Design a protein around this ligand. Structure first.
Ligand SMILES: CCCCCCCCCCC(=O)OC[C@H](COP(=O)(O)OC[C@H](O)COP(=O)(O)OC[C@@H](COC(=O)CC)OC(=O)CCC)OC(=O)CCCCCCCC
Ligand SMILES: CCCCCCCCCCCCCCCCCC(=O)OC[C@H](COP(=O)(O)OCCN)OC(=O)CCCCCCCCCCCCC
Ligand code: HEM
Ligand code: HEM
Ligand SMILES: COc1c(O)c(C)c(C/C=C(\C)CC/C=C(\C)CC/C=C(\C)CC/C=C(\C)CC/C=C(\C)CCC=C(C)C)c(O)c1OC
Ligand SMILES: CCCCCCCCCCCCCCC(=O)OCCCOP(=O)(O)OC[C@@H](O)COP(=O)(O)OCCCOC(C)=O
Ligand SMILES: CCCCCCCCCCCCCCC(=O)O[C@H](COC(=O)CCCCCCCCCCCC)COP(=O)(O)O
Ligand SMILES: CCCCCCCCCCCCCCCCCC(=O)O[C@H](COC(=O)CCCCCC)COP(=O)(O)OCCN
Lengths: 62, 110, 44, 110, 431, 54, 126, 126
C-alpha cells in the first residue's frame, strides 16, 4: 500500500475539529490542578512552621 | 545548545528527569521507585521537626513523646505522619522488590 | 543611530521584558504574600 | 566564577555551624552570646518581633532554644558535605590554576 | 495585461512585451491534482506526457515550434512557443490537438509507451529526491481525507490501473470552455490574437465542471519515514496559512522573509541579518533551510524545511527555530520589518519579470482563473510598503501562537522527539 | 464551554491568577466546612452546653 | 577585562603629549623591571589570559613559527618555577625583544566584534 | 544462562526416543499455547535475551531482510502492550511460521567459543 494513504483515525476524531473545544477544556483542568496544589503546599509549610512557636505550657506562665 | 544541557548542575537534572529515554510499554509497577523517594523525604522532614522537642534520657523519653502529642502545635500531626509513614515505606518497598522478582530485573547486566 | 546592549541586555528588551520582569512582580509576586497568610503580615 | 560562588555559600554555613554548637555547652559565654545575636533580628521593620519569638520558642533564651539549636547543629554539617561535592564538580571541568597565571595545558603530570 | 471575453465565451488574456524575441500561446485550465479522487490520481500527469510525446513533438518541430506543460494542484497548462511572426502557425497546431482531432494521440501503441515512461519517473522520484518527497508527504498528512492531499504526479499503485477510457472521462468533465483561459505573452499584441481566434468560428459546447463535496481542512498530525541507510535527515514543519484572495496574503509572505533561506557552504549567506543564525552556527546544526508560504484556493501552509547531518542534535535545531517564531507575537523589532520589505520586493520582482515567456504565461493564466484579472506589480509594491509592526503581531497571534502543527520526516530521524514536545514550543510559558 | 472562553480567550490562566485565586479559595473553604461540621454536631458542642446551664 | 582598545586609547594620548611623556614613561620602565617576567624568559604578550573568544581568535591567526616559539617559552617558565630558581643571565629577555607581537591580531578581532554589535542592535531612520 | 548446546543435547535425546516423544511433546504443545507470545505477533527467537557477546555475534551475521522483519515484530509488540489489547486473529503467528531462524547462528558461535577455551588452557603431552 502507498505511504501517501493515511490510515483510519475516524473513531477518535472530533465531530468537527473546532480548536477551542479541546483547548478550553484542557486549560481549565491544568489551571484547577495548579490552584489546588498551591493552596495545599501553602497549608503544609505553615503547619511545620507553627510547630516552632511557643507551646501551651510555655505561654501559660506568661 | 540549550542552557539545561550546558550548565554543570542543570545537565544532571536534564539527563535524569527530563530527557531520559524510557521504554514505551512500562506499566504502573514501574512507579514504585518514585514513591520511595517521596517516602524518604517525608521521614527526614517530619523527624527533624520532632527532634527539636525530644529528650533521650531514660526518665524523660516517654514523657517527651507525650509532650509532643499534647503541647506542641500540630504535634499530633507530626507523630502520626511519622509512625504511619514508616509502615507505608515498607509496603512500597515490598512491592518494589517483588516487581524485580517477577520481571527478572536482577539479571545481567543489572 | 544604534541601540544599546549593556553587555547582554537591550533597551528594547526593556520595552516589553521590563514590564514583564515587573509582571514577574505583578504575576508570581503573590507567592511572597499568600505564602505568609497563616501567620499574619497585614500591611501594603 | 561558579567555583568561587559555591565556596562563599560554604563559608556562611560554617559560621552558622560553629555558633550553634557553642550554645550547646550552655556556659556563661554561651548564654550571653546567643542573647546578643538573636536580639539583632528585632530591628527588621514590621517582622522584627515575630522572627525573634519564633527563633526562641518563647520569650527569651530558654529550654526550647537549646533543644532546637542542638538538632540544627547535627544537620548543617551534612549540608556542608553536599556542597563540597558540588564544589568539586565545578573544579573538574576546568582544572586548577597555577602561580604564573598562564595556561597549564602544555605540561601536566598525573 | 488586457482581458477580453469573446462572443462565444472564450476568455483571452495578453501581456505584450515589444522587447522580446519570442512569443508564447497556450491554454490554461482550472482543474489540477485537487480535482481527482484516490482511484484516478495521475490522469493529469498522463495527459501532460501524451501532449509531449514523440509523434506530437515531431510535427511541431518541423514548423519551428516548442511545447511545454505544467501540472499543479489548481491548474494545468499547454503552451506552444514560436518566433514573433509565426503566431498563427502555433494557433493551428493548438487547434488540431485539442478541438478538432484528439483520437490519434490516444492510440494503443502510443498509450502503452507513454505509461511505462511515467511509471519510471515516479519510481525514480520516490527513491532519490528526498527534499521533494518530504514536502509531498506534508501535504498528505495536513489535509488528509480532503482533495488537497493527493500528490501531483500520482502514486505508483494508482498509475498501473489507468486505461485509455479514464483519460477520455477526465477530458469530458474538465477540458471545457467555461474552465479555460487562452493566454499570450512575449512579442504578441492583444488585437491580432483576438482576430486570429475569431477567424475560426469554434462551436465549443457549454458544459460545466463537477463541483466537489469536501472542503479542504487542516489537521495536526505527523508521519515518519525512517531509513537508517541514508546519510542525512530531511524535515518539514508547518501551520495553517493563508489562501489566495486573503486580506493577509502579503503579511504572511513578509513574515517568512524575516527568517529566509540559508546555505552553510556559501560565505555570503552566513552574513545575513537573521537572529536565528547566531544559535545554529556555533555547533553547525544544519546544512540548509528555507521558509515558505504556500497559498491555494481553499487553504495554505506556512513553515520551513531543513536538511542536516548533525543527527544527534536534531532537538536543538527545532527548539531554536520555534523560539524565534514566538518573537513575532511579542518582541519583533522595526529593523527586521524594514529589511524584509526590501527583500520581498526583490524576490517577487524576479519572479514576475524574468525573461521567459513560458513562465509568464503560467503566472498570468493561473491568476485570471481565480480573480478574473491580474494585480499589477506597482500596486503590489504599495501594499507591501504599508505593513507595520502591529500588522505582524496581529497576524502571528492568530496564526502562530499556541497552534497545531504538521510534521513530516525521512532518513536518520531517531533524534526527532514526539509530537507533544514540539507542540509545546508554540507558546513561551513566559507571557 | 463558552464560559471558559469569556474569561480567558484561548489562553492558559496565568501563574499570577493561580496564586491570587488560591488565597481566596482558602478563606471560603475553611468557612464552609466549619459551618457544616458544627451544624452536624449541634447540641453536643460546649457552646450549646454552656447556654443550658444559664 | 578592560579592553585593549581602551588601553591603547589612553596610552597613545600619553605618548603624544610632550609633558606627560617625560613624567609617566620613566615610572613605567621601573614598573616592568620590578615585575620580573623577563628573568623567567617571558614576554608580556605571553602573560595575557586566554580563556575568552577574542583571545582564542587571535591565537589561531598567529603564524606557525611564532606559535612554536611561544610554546617553548611557556614550557621553560613552568620548569624554572618548580625548581625555585631563575634563568641564567644570558637567557633573559632583552628590552628590544619585548615587542607586542600579538597586539595587532587582538585589535582587529575586537574591531570586528564591535561592528557586529552595532549592526545587530541598529535602528531604522525612515 | 544454561547453554544452547545443552538444550539441544537433551531435546534431541527426547525426540529420538519413541516412548519419550509420545509423553513429552503433547505437554510441550500446551505449554506454548498457554504462553501467548504468538498472540502478540512474536516468534520464540525474538524472546531470547541479547545482552551477551554470543548473542551479539549471531545478530550481526543475520541476513538483512530477516533483520528488518524482526525489528518490525518487536515494535508492533510494544505498541500492542501499552494499549492493553491483543492483535486481530488474522495476524497471529501460526505454528508453521514459528521456526528457529536464529538457532543455527547461535550454535556455531558457541562451538567456536568453546574451541578457543580448550586451546588457551591446553597442556603439553611430551
Ligand atoms: C500503600 C498504598 C500505596 C498507594 C499507591 C500504590 C498504587 C499502585 C498499586 C500497584 C500497581 O501499580 O498496580 C497497578 C496495576 C495496573 O497496572 P496497569 O498499567 O497494567 O493498568 C493500566 C490501566 O488499565 C489503565 O490506567 P489509566 O492510565 O487508563 O487510568 C489511571 C487509573 C489509575 O491507576 C492507578 O493510579 C494505579 C492503580 O485510573 C483508574 O483506574 C480509573 C478509576 C478511578 O494493577 C494490577 O495489575 C492489579 C490491581 C491490584 C494490584 C494491587 C496489589 C497491591 C497488593
Ligand atoms: C525479602 C523478600 C520480600 C518479598 C516480598 C513478597 C511480598 C510482596 C507483597 C506484594 C505482592 C504483590 C506482587 C507484586 C508483583 C508485581 C508483578 C506482577 O505480579 O504482575 C502482575 C500480574 C501479571 O502481570 P502481567 O504482565 O502478566 O499482565 C497483567 C494484566 N492484568 O498480574 C496479576 O496477577 C495481578 C497481581 C495481583 C497480586 C495480588 C497478590 C498479592 C496480595 C498480597 C496481600 C498481602 C497483604 C495481606
Ligand atoms: C528512613 C527514615 C526513618 C525511619 C524508617 C524512621 C522510623 C521510625 C519509627 C518506626 C519510629 C517509631 C515511631 C513510633 O512508633 O512512635 C521512629 C521514631 C522517632 N524518629 Fe524516626 N525514622 C526515620 C527518620 C528519622 C530521622 C532522620 C529523625 C531525626 C532527625 C527521626 C526522629 C525520630 C524521633 C525523634 C522519634 C521519637 C519517637 C516519636 O516521636 O515517635 N526519624 N522513627
Ligand atoms: C570545607 C570547605 C572547602 C573544601 C573541602 C574545599 C576544597 C577544595 C579543593 C580540594 C580544591 C582543589 C585545589 C586546591 O586545593 O586549591 C579547591 C579549590 C578552590 N576552592 Fe575550595 N574548598 C573549601 C572551601 C572554599 C572556600 C571557603 C572558598 C572561597 C571563598 C573556596 C574556593 C576555591 C577556589 C576558587 C578554588 C580554585 C583555586 C585554584 O584552582 O587555583 N573553597 N577547594
Ligand atoms: C527511571 O526513572 C526515574 C524516575 O522515575 C525518577 C522519579 C527519578 C528521580 C529520583 C528520585 C525521586 C529519588 C531521589 C531521592 C533522594 C535523593 C532522597 C534524598 C532526600 C533528601 C536530600 C532530604 C533532605 C531534607 C532536608 C535537608 C530537610 C530540611 C529541613 C530543615 C532545613 C528544617 C529546618 C527549618 C528551619 C526554618 C530552621 C529518577 O532518577 C529516575 O531515573 C532516571
Ligand atoms: C521544560 C522542562 C520542564 C520540566 C519540569 C519537570 C520537573 C519535575 C521535577 C520533579 C520530578 C521528579 C522529582 C525528583 C527530582 O527532582 O530529583 C532531583 C534530581 C534527581 O536526582 P539527580 O540529581 O538527577 O541524580 C543524581 C545522581 O544520579 C548523580 O550522581 P552525582 O554524584 O551527582 O554524579 C557526579 C559525581 C561527582 O562526584 C565527585 C566526587 O565530584
Ligand atoms: C511533591 C509532589 C506534589 C507536587 C504536585 C505539583 C503538581 C502541579 C501540577 C500543576 C502544573 C500546572 C502547569 C503544568 C504545565 O504545563 O507546566 C509545564 C511544566 O510543569 C511541570 O513540569 C509540572 C511538574 C510536576 C512535578 C511532578 C513531580 C513528579 C513526581 C515525582 C516525585 C518524586 C519525589 C510547563 O512546561 P510544558 O508546557 O513544556 O509542558
Ligand atoms: C550529593 C550532591 C549531589 C549533587 C547534585 C547536583 C545537582 C543539584 C543541583 C540542581 C540544580 C540547582 C542549581 C542550578 C542553578 C543554576 C546554577 C548556575 O546557573 O550556575 C552559574 C551561576 O550560579 C552560580 O554562580 C553558583 C550557583 C550555586 C547554586 C547553589 C545551589 C552559571 O554558570 P554558567 O552556566 O553560566 O557557566 C559560565 C558560562 N559563561
Amino acid at each position: 500500500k502507498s505511504t501517501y494513504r493515511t490510515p483510519n483515525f475516524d473513531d477518535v476524531l472530533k465531530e468537527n475539529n473546532d480548536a477551542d473545544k479541546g483547548r478550553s477544556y484542557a486549560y481549565f483542568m491544568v489551571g484547577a490542578m495548579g490552584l489546588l496544589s498551591s493552596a495545599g503546599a501553602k497549608s503544609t509549610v505553615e503547619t511545620f512552621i507553627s510547630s516552632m512557636t511557643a507551646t501551651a505550657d510555655v505561654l501559660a506562665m506568661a | 545548545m540549550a542552557f539545561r544541557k550546558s550548565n554543570v548542575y542543570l545537565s544532571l537534572v536534564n539527563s535524569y528527569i527530563i530527557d531520559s529515554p524510557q521504554p514505551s510499554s512500562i506499566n504502573y509497577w514501574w512507579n514504585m521507585g518514585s514513591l520511595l523517594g517521596l517516602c524518604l523525604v517525608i521521614q527526614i522532614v517530619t523527624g527533624i521537626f520532632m527532634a527539636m522537642h525530644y529528650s533521650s534520657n531514660i526518665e524523660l523519653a516517654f514523657s517527651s513523646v507525650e509532650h509532643i502529642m499534647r503541647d506542641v502545635h500540630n504535634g499530633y500531626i507530626l507523630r502520626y505522619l511519622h509512625a504511619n509513614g514508616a509502615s507505608f515505606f515498607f509496603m512500597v518497598m515490598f512491592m518494589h522488590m517483588a516487581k524485580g522478582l517477577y520481571y527478572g530485573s536482577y539479571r545481567s547486566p543489572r | 543611530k544604534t541601540g544599546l546592549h549593556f553587555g547582554r541586555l537591550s533597551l528594547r528588551s526593556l520595552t516589553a521584558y521590563a514590564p514583564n520582569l515587573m509582571l514577574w512582580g505583578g504575576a508570581s509576586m503573590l507567592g511572597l504574600f499568600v505564602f505568609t497568610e497563616g501567620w499574619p503580615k497585614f500591611q501594603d | 566564577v561558579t567555583l568561587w560562588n559555591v565556596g562563599v555559600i560554604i563559608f556562611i554555613l560554617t559560621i552558622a555551624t560553629a555558633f550553634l554548637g557553642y550554645c550547646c555547652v550552655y556556659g556563661q559565654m554561651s548564654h550571653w552570646g546567643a542573647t546578643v545575636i538573636t536580639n539583632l533580628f528585632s530591628a527588621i521593620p514590621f517582622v522584627g518581633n515575630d522572627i525573634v519569638s519564633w527563633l526562641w520558642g518563647g520569650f527569651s533564651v530558654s529550654n526550647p532554644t537549646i533543644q532546637r539549636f542542638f538538632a540544627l547543629h547535627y544537620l548543617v554539617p551534612f549540608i556542608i558535605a553536599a556542597m563540597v561535592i558540588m564544589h568539586l564538580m565545578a573544579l573538574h571541568i576546568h582544572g586548577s590554576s597555577n602561580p604564573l597565571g598562564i595556561t597549564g595545558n602544555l605540561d601536566r603530570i598525573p | 495585461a488586457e482581458v477580453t471575453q469573446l462572443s462565444n465565451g472564450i476568455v483571452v488574456a495578453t501581456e505584450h512585451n515589444p522587447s522580446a524575441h519570442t512569443a508564447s500561446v497556450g491554454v490554461v485550465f482550472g482543474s489540477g491534482a485537487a480535482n481527482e479522487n484516490p482511484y484516478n490520481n495521475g490522469v493529469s500527469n498522463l495527459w501532460k506526457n501524451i501532449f509531449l510525446s514523440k509523434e506530437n513533438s515531431a510535427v511541431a518541430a518541423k514548423e519551428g515550434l516548442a511545447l511545454s506543460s505544467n501540472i499543479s494542484r489548481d491548474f494545468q497548462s499547454y503552451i506552444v512557443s514560436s518566433l514573433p511572426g509565426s503566431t498563427d502557425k502555433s494557433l493551428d497546431f493548438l487547434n488540431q490537438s485539442f478541438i478538432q482531432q484528439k483520437a490519434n494521440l490516444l492510440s494503443s501503441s502510443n498509450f502503452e509507451a507513454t505509461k511505462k515512461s511515467v511509471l519510471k519517473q515516479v519510481q525514480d522520484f520516490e527513491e532519490n529526491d528526498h527534499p521533494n518527497r518530504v514536502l509531498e508527504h506534508l501535504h498528505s498528512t495536513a489535509f488528509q481525507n480532503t482533495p488537497l492531499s493527493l500528490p501531483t504526479r500520482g502514486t505508483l499503485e494508482s498509475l498501473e490501473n489507468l486505461v485509455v477510457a479514464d483519460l477520455e472521462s477526465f477530458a469530458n468533465n474538465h477540458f471545457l470552455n467555461s474552465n479555460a483561459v487562452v493566454v499570450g505573452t512575449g512579442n504578441i499584441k492583444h488585437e491580432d490574437l483576438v482576430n486570429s481566434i475569431e477567424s475560426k468560428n469554434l462551436s465549443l459546447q457549454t458544459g460545466t465542471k463537477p463541483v466537489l463535496k469536501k472542503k479542504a481542512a487542516f489537521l495536526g498530525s505527523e508521519v515518519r519515514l525512517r531509513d537508517d541507510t541514508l546519510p542525512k535527515a530531511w524535515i518539514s514543519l508547518a501551520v495553517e496559512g493563508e489562501p489566495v484572495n486573503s486580506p493577509n496574503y502579503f503579511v504572511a509572505k513578509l513574515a517568512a522573509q524575516i527568517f529566509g533561506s540559508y546555505n552553510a557552504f556559501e560565505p555570503a549567506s552566513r552574513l545575513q541579518g537573521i537572529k536565528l543564525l547566531d544559535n545554529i552556527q556555533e555547533y553547525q546544526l544544519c546544512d540548509n533551510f528555507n521558509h515558505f508560504s504556500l497559498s491555494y484556493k481553499d487553504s495554505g501552509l506556512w513553515g520551513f524545511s531543513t536538511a542536516t547531518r548533525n543527527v544527534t542534535m536534531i532537538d536543538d535545531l527545532i527548539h531554536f527555530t520555534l523560539k524565534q517564531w514566538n518573537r513575532l507575537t511579542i518582541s519583533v523589532t522595526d529593523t527586521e520589518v524594514e529589511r524584509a520589505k526590501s527583500l520581498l520586493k526583490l524576490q517577487l520582482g524576479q519572479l514576475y519579470e524574468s525573461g521567459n515567456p513560458v513562465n509568464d504565461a503560467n503566472l498570468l493564466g493561473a491568476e485570471v482563473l481565480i480573480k478574473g484579472s491580474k494585480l499589477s506589480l506597482g500596486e503590489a509594491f504599495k501594499k507591501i510598503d504599508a505593513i507595520t509592526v502591529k500588522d505582524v503581531k496581529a497576524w502571528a497571534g492568530k496564526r502562530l501562537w499556541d497552534q497545531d502543527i504538521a510534521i513530516a520526516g525521512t532518513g536518520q530521524i531517531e533524534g526527532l522527539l514526539d509530537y507533544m514536545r514540539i507542540r509545546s514550543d508554540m507558546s513561551m510559558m513566559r507571557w | 464551554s463558552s464560559l471558559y472562553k469569556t474569561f480567558f480567550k484561548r489562553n492558559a490562566v496565568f501563574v499570577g491568577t493561580i496564586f491570587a485565586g488560591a488565597f481566596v479559595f482558602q478563606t471560603v473553604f475553611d468557612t464552609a466546612i466549619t459551618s457544616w461540621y458544627e451544624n452536624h454536631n449541634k447540641g453536643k458542642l460546649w457552646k450549646d452546653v454552656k447556654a443550658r446551664i444559664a | 577585562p578592560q579592553s585593549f582598545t581602551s588601553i591603547a586609547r589612553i596610552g597613545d594620548y600619553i605618548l603624544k603629549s610632550p609633558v606627560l611623556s617625560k613624567l609617566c614613561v620613566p615610572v613605567a620602565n621601573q614598573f616592568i623591571n620590578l615585575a620580573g617576567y623577563k628573568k623567567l624568559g617571558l614576554k608580556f604578550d605571553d602573560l595575557i589570559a586566554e580563556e575568552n573568544p577574542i583571545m582564542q581568535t587571535a591565537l589561531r591567526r598567529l603564524p606557525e613559527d611564532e606559535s612554536y616559539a611561544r610554546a617553548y617559552r611557556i614550557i621553560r617558565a613552568h620548569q624554572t618555577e618548580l625548581t625555585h630558581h631563575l634563568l641564567p643571565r644570558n637567557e633573559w629577555i632583552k628590552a628590544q625583544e619585548d615587542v607586542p607581537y600579538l597586539l595587532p591580531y587582538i585589535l582587529e578581532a575586537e574591531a570586528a566584534a564591535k561592528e557586529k554589535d552595532e549592526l545587530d542592535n541598529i535602528e531604522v531612520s525612515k
